[PDB]
Structure formats: structure tokens, C-alpha cells
Amino acid sequence: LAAALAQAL
Numbered sequence: 965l966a967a968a969l970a971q972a973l
């Protein structure tokens with residue numbers, strides 16, 4: 965989940 969967001973950065 966975290967990674968899924970973090971791709972933004």
C-alpha cells in the first residue's frame with residue numbers, strides 16, 4: 965500500500 969502511493973515521488 966505504502967509503495968503504491970510512494971511511486972508518486
Ligand SMILES: *C(=O)c1ccc(-c2ccc(C(=O)OCC)cn2)nc1
Pocket residue numbers: 965966967968969
Ligand atoms: C503497497 O503498496 C505494497 C506494495 C508491495 C508490498 C510488498 C511487500 C512485500 C514484497 C516482497 O517481495 O516480500 C518478500 C518477503 C513486495 N511487495 N507491500 C505493500
Ligand SMILES: *NNC(=O)c1ccc(-c2ccc(C(N)=O)cn2)nc1
Pocket residue numbers: 970971972973
Ligand atoms: N517517486 N519515485 C521516483 O520518482 C523514482 C523513480 C525511479 C526510481 C528508480 C529506482 C530504482 C531504479 C533501479 N534501476 O534500480 C530505477 N529507478 N525510484 C524512484
Ligand SMILES: Cc1ccccc1C
Pocket residue numbers: 965966968
Ligand atoms: C491494498 C491497497 C489498497 C488500496 C491501494 C493500494 C493498495 C496496494
Ligand SMILES: Cc1ccccc1C
Pocket residue numbers: 966967968970971
Ligand atoms: C519502497 C519505497 C521506498 C521509498 C520510496 C518508494 C518506495 C516504493
Ligand SMILES: Cc1ccccc1C
Pocket residue numbers: 967968971
Ligand atoms: C512494481 C512497482 C510498482 C509501484 C511501486 C514500486 C514498484 C516496484
